[PDB]
Design a protein around this ligand. Structure first.
Ligand code: WBE
Ligand code: WBE
Lengths: 306, 306
């Protein structure tokens, strides 16, 4: 029993974190085989950040301008290239701790574990969702940039996020590991605004199923809804539209609990219209949207507590 | 910016998790140097669990009855002993991945990271507090027993919890790594009840300071309280009494924010008496009590956002 925001075990990623320094700028990098990946704005000085021309900045650099430190050993940079907003530093030593890995670009609504790092040393691990507006609500301080987000599947690490900046509103923006930003953002020190965010409906439904699996049913009701009528309520409360694909993805949880997806939608509709009236679900007084259906299946029992 | 429940990086503990099997009972063990630590009820059959005499059960066992598996290698048990409710299996191989470590018995109100494991394989990491009634609100399924809780300080792992059982109410009970239960519990399969729980007042205050550091002040007020008058309100709302020791521990956070501890107590009093009126603090609609003052200092900026 129980239900917690649960990160993946971080050891396979810990062994890949390094420190990258150029001039007086230091941030984190990801060392896989003989390549170190890091945000390209490491090459900027504080004045370069306002409006940098990165190609003009990088051509003025040499391999030996980059200082890469893995624990207490320096790695010699023997080549460098830029791929979108990530810098790739070829080093003379392959990381002996390289896990099986993939780079993946995730969809909004998906979750991942963040290994927050400072000066190449891991400090903590927590779970994040990619918001519909392509920000994440992380916990990051100066020096965190280059920290990565990941999922793990049978000892393969799928890296999906590299941290690049905190926006003026205090939420966070970054790239896939091939250097493409999530969302409309660019890597320059300008005040950039995210689009208006929405609540991840399929995730709230997954979390309601988690609550039922764990033995709680107080929010259920005898009603059902059509998909169309549910989405009319969803729009009113700034929830993302629920698609038939979402309904299909919730199939297994519906089958395990015996609660049809559109019946759980009717529960959610009632919760949105009436509130919780002082009650909690899985210890929360708000409707939680940062658990995917996969996250629920991963953590909850495979048999519902009746 | 941001504030999340943040676990310690788990790699140093991952390399210590093994599987222990006796008869048809399999659970997790902790492999440090040439000793494997695990819950002693691994030696019980399903019938032994009702009321076991562990000394009588253990004297009937031989070293070779214990099967210890570390990944895909078997460790030979060359001795065994019982220390309170933990079994210590001496094996013929020292763990090459043993971190610097200590065993510590924590006080209620302290937090730790849990590495949830099944069949000796880590599955997830999350943060827990030891409740005032000496349970934890974990997330655990069958096979999790022997999973450990820990804190890390400058590459030293302080192990403080080993998981032994889920109570009828779905909360969790366990021991320190020397086998002494937290709370009044015993390791037998009987319905055991925890004492009535309370809210960890010093932790709620720490979390209010975290909110101020992150830039939010809406809950502050112009009032102050005496310690005695605050604790009269604390008792009404099932909060633990606040001691002068707690006030001292909050000293650094008070100094960083410029908010006296007894002034923050007056904010908390108003929040308890009036509720939040539809507002949130650090994204929560409830008052959070599973962040210690240390947890806040560890994660938040050292300079308040004014
Ligand atoms: N993670 C992180 C982090 C956090 C703090 C400091 C440093 C870092 C890592 C570091 N690498 C980082 O992100 N630096 C960026 C600057 C940067 C470097 C490089 C590139 Cl390519 C792009 C960028 Cl934008 C940075 O300084 N951003 C600040 C963070 C801030 O001041 N936050 C407090 C207010 C939160 N909002 C709030 N609080 N309360 C209310 N009600 N609202 C916001 C900003 C301000 C002007 C601006 F024009 C753009 C952005
Ligand atoms: N972690 C964990 C875990 C979770 C499930 C299964 C297995 C494990 C690990 C495994 N090692 C474990 O803990 N087994 C224990 C049995 C045990 C083994 C050895 C020793 Cl020394 C001591 C003990 Cl007690 C066990 O089966 N406990 C069940 C768990 C249960 O059935 N939970 C569903 C209800 C939650 N409550 C609720 N849900 N909804 C509402 N409103 N209330 C509770 C119980 C039931 C009778 C009883 F007499 C004592 C305790």
């Amino acid at each position: 029993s129980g239900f917690r925001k649960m990160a993946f075990p971080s050891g396979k990623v810990e062994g890949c974190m390094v420190q990258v320094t150029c001039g007086t700028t230091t941030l984190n990098g990801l060392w896989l085989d003989d390549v170190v990946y890091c945000p390209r704005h490491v090459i900027c000085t504080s004045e370069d950040m306002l409006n940098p021309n990165y190609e003009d900045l990088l051509i003025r650099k040499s391999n030996h301008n980059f200082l890469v430190q893995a624990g207490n050993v320096q790695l010699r940079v023997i080549g460098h290239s830029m791929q979108n907003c990530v810098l790739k530093l070829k080093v003379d030593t392959a990381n002996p701790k390289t896990p099986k890995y993939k780079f993946v670009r995730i969809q909004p609504g998906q979750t991942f574990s963040v290994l927050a790092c400072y000066n190449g040393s891991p400090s903590g691990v927590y779970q994040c969702a990619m918001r519909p507006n392509f920000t994440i609500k992380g916990s990051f301080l100066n020096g965190s940039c280059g920290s990565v987000g990941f999922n793990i599947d049978y000892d393969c690490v799928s890296f999906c996020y590299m941290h690049h900046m905190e926006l003026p509103t205090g939420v966070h923006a970054g790239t896939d590991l091939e250097g493409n930003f999530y969302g409309p953002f660019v890597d320059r020190q300008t005040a950039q605004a995210a689009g208006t965010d929405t609540t991840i409906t399929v995730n709230v439904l997954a979390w309601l199923y988690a609550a039922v699996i764990n033995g709680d049913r107080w929010f259920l009701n005898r009603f059902t809804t059509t998909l169309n009528d549910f989405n009319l309520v969803a729009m009113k409360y700034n929830y993302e539209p629920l698609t038939q694909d979402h309904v299909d993805i919730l199939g297994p949880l519906s089958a395990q609990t015996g609660i049809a997806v559109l019946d759980m939608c009717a529960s959610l509709k009632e919760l949105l219209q009436n509130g919780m009236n002082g009650r909690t679900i899985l210890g929360s007084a708000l409707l939680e949207d940062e658990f995917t259906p996969f996250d629920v299946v991963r953590q909850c029992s495979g048999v519902t507590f009746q």
